[PDB]
Amino acid sequence: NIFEMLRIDEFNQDVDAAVRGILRNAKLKPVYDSLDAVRRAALINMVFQMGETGVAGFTNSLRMLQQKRWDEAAVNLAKSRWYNQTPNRAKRVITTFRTGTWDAYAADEVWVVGMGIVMSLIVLAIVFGNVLVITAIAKFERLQTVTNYFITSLACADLVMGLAVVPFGAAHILTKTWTFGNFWCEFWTSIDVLCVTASIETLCVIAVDRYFAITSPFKYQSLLTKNKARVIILMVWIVSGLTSFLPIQMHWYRATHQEAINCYAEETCCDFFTNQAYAIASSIVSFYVPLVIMVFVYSRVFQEAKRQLDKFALKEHKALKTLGIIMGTFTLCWLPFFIVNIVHVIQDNLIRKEVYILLNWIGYVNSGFNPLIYCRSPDFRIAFQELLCLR
């Protein structure tokens, strides 16, 4: 049938016409009558792509296929303008001729399925992990601390990632294209920048909050009230939202080269082409600036914890270490991505696109690590056990 074979590359009337064109041709009928049912469909794939006359141009290639010399015809089909025009399309056709199997199309199909299950588990781990953190604090009255309010704000940021960013960013790789329009493409990117910016800014608030707490008689009591804590959280999303949506919605990120304009007008293209000014400025504002002050402030918190230091003291000192892992994990998962943004813009085509996507997804997985780190604190660990295990 080879209907799915052409469906995997980039309708019934064109297939029947190409089959009739091969039988009427006097240079394709002797070759078509000497190939197995698998290789016959690969021959029609070239006629439907190139043409009836273009396929007949390969006089040396069809002669090797007629002599059943697959290994010699594999190197002969790699020396043409068709093999250099589309390297991904030709390599699957040559492999189909050489092996006589669908291994070139099956391996590319199993990879989508196999990687699709993995990315679905990431979404499930992020959502289920963060919804557990939200529920544990919102239910138990003993976990109603100012830091947990910021943890709720941080878990909400990671929750939207696994509900609006990661799922739509996963279908963009599996389908190799974008099937949501340009309206949601500029919105999906806006949410992406927002949650990451709101995360590093929320962690920055925690570090400052823990410094005011450690300079207090209780050494661990936040000086903020319950109402003031919600005000800070509200102002964090307002500030981060202004440094995320406004640069995107007002089209301050757009590039100038023709490849970007053609991708902006294309509904099926959602590549985040940024200019040399926005890529550095936004990374500095939305990541680098809050990162430096977060490390600097929280390092002095650790310095005051060792300078002032019972059984209760170790429990709350480990809580500061728990927040130090949250800031450390968030750093060691987004820093390589934002380093590339500086590298990719300064020198074009120095970082591969696959590497850029990979490091971007390392930060996506970071949105599911925080609930597992909260299990270090027995206060969060028990609250999870009461909700899930004990029930």
């Epitope: 109603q144 601390t145 209780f218 009591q221 000086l223 009230t225 319950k226």
Partner: nanobody
Framework: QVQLQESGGGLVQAGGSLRLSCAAS????????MGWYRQAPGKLRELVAA???????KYADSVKGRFTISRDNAKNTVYLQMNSLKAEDTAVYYC?????????????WGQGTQVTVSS
């Protein structure tokens, strides 16, 4: 390293009045929720009055309208006005301090003052 010290207890005739106070020292106090608990002879401890950080006061049905809880953040002391004392109010009153930490709220208690009502 917080400290809770009650005061104002003692002996009082039935129907009289008493004013309990609890000095808190070791935290901010203005941000922590206070409360008063009492321990009757041969009975479990019972919450009778509790005031939040904002000022929301909660009382028990057995002491509703007769007791009145309040606090003074300038002196870091939570007060408990006890009016129309009955024989059932004869208990050892404890001062509770819910100081919030990093991830959880820690409950701290005072030594406890004893209030006896003679009929």
């Amino acid at each position: 390293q917080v400290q809770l010290q009650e005061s104002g207890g003692g002996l009082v005739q039935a129907g009289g009045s008493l004013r309990l106070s609890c000095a808190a020292s070791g935290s901010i106090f203005s941000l922590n929720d206070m409360g008063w608990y009492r321990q009757a002879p041969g009975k479990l401890r019972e919450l009778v009055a509790a005031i939040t950080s904002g000022g929301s006061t909660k009382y028990a049905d057995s002491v509703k309208g007769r007791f009145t809880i309040s606090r003074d953040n300038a002196k870091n002391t939570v007060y408990l006005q006890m009016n129309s004392l009955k024989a059932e109010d004869t208990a050892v009153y404890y001062c509770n301090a819910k100081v919030a930490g990093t991830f959880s709220i820690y409950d701290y208690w005072g030594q406890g003052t004893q209030v006896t009502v003679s009929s």
